[model samples]
Target: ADLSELLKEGTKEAHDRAENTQFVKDFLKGNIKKELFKLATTALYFTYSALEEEMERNKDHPAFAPLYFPMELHRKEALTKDMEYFFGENWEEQVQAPKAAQKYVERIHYIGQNEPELLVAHAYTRYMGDLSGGQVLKKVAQRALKLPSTGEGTQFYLFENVDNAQQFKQLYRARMNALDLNMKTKERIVEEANKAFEYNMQIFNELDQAGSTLARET
Candidate 1:
């Protein structure tokens, strides 16, 4: 089977789990507060920081060859800008990932250090989702939070280098399908992609619980 098709098939359940999470539902419904949104951004900052760092660290690796598209998809700088917009000049100091996010970052770093090939799975799961549903998130956040549509606080969802997201995603999937890998390796990548979704769902659940507690207190 084609690698892209295999990945989509394998990770469909995981993707559904993440999309059905309470946090996502709340956000989509515009019921989530701006404070919660900022907190979620903080968690995402940690995730992208680790993932992008690993991408850079493994860019020259043979396993990273087919999937390397750093210039087009890198989000660290954009996330940093969003963090600063949300948290002020002391953004780094003010923002910290919760436990779930810490675990997610650690997993990304582990793959970078010990299993760089798996970075492809992580990249596929994250960047593609960012290019896809993440756009809907940008619109929802803008309407809910009353933020400007100029992509200030939502820079995480904006791909300045990608003029056509659909075409870019097609190219990305083509690259994935083109990667040279045996069945075992491809299966492993598919499994790792599923795990990526699990980690994301965990983060969402954690944030949802915290948001609920805060809502009750208020």
Candidate 2:
């Protein structure tokens, strides 16, 4: 009846597929545990450096000011825990995903040594959206890709078929409607989606700050 409702419904499925896909599970367990953590921490620093550069270049840009405040806060509150969880074996060692994935991780990274932060962030965020308003999700995805294209160094956000994003949207809508989710479940999903966005924005801020720091030193 309502096309708007229809789009939302499709989004649900796309989220479901993206979240539950075997490809995601394998990547997290296999390659992301060790390698991703190292790169992410480094990138967080790099982002901070980049933001500083942008603000210096154009203090007039409103975008530059907000980036600094949010990232500094993110570094203190969230990033520390994330680093501990991934690097310190506080939670990761106990998880079955890592143990079951040891061989797989070795095998996969053998083919390719790194998993770009953007790819994981994009896929995870896209999969988590239940109440995320597809427009917002799209904006996030675009932002991740918008970082300076420094080839493999910074282009972790781009996927092989990433340009075919519109086609992915159509499929996503179809999947959402076919889902058997209820209102309560959908509400919880929305909450998680919000958290995902918040976490990502924090990461972005940190990265911007790290980037800035580097530029000043250079």
Candidate 3:
């Protein structure tokens, strides 16, 4: 199987598990409490920061450059703006990465520095997933939190430069499919993606607990 299909086919259970995470379900249902939403957005901020850092470092790498569409796909800047909106001017000083998110960042850094080719899996899981699922989640957050309708809290989901999500998705998958990789490497990427989902769920679970830790704020 090509990289794109193989990754998707292999990530089936992991993807479902991520979707079913309590935090995710709550967010989707617009049951996202205010503090939980803040913590969740914070987590996303730390995450994209690490992933984008790695991507920038590896953007010119032979095995990874095919996927470098930074203008359209990068989330760190958008997340940064959302962070400012969510946490105010001192957002930088207040934001903290929970252990789960820090560990996920660690993994991304390790792969980025040591196995740049494997970075594709992370890019797939995050930026690839963002275009569709994130839009739904963005609307949910905006409505539930009563955030301004304009690009304020939910800026992370809007790929302003990309004219069409469907078209971009197709273009992205085509790029992945055309990358130079053999079956063994493709399978490795698929494996990494499934593992990445575990890391993602761990982050979700952390957020679930953080919601309770935030206590009585709802």
TM-score for each of the candidates: 0.96, 0.34, 0.95
Model 3 Cα lDDT, one tens digit per residue, 113-211: 999999999999888788877667777888999989876988988888988898999999998888899889988899999889989989888888888
Task: Report the C-alpha displacement of residue 197, candidate 3, in angstroms.
Answer: 0.4
Comparing 2 and 3 by lDDT, which wins?
Answer: 3
Model 3 earns a TM-score of: 0.95
lDDT of each: 0.87, 0.36, 0.87
The weakest ten consecutive residues by lDDT in model 2 span 111-120
Residue 100 in model 3: shift from native, Å? 0.4
lDDT of 2 by residue, 37-56 (tens): 34444444333233233333
Candidate 2: list runs displaced more than 4 Å: 1-124, 127-158, 161-164
lDDT (0-100) at residue 118 of candidate 1?
A: 81
> In candidate 1, which residue pairs clash?
none
Model 1 per-residue lDDT tens digits across residues 1-218? 98888898898888888878888888899997888888888898899999988988988888887677777888888888988898898867756678999999999999999999888999998888888876688888999999997779998887878888999989888877877789999999999998888888888888988898998998
Q: What residue runs in model 3 are displaced by over 4 Å at the alpha carbon? A: 215-218
Candidate 1, residue 28: CA error in Å? Answer: 1.0
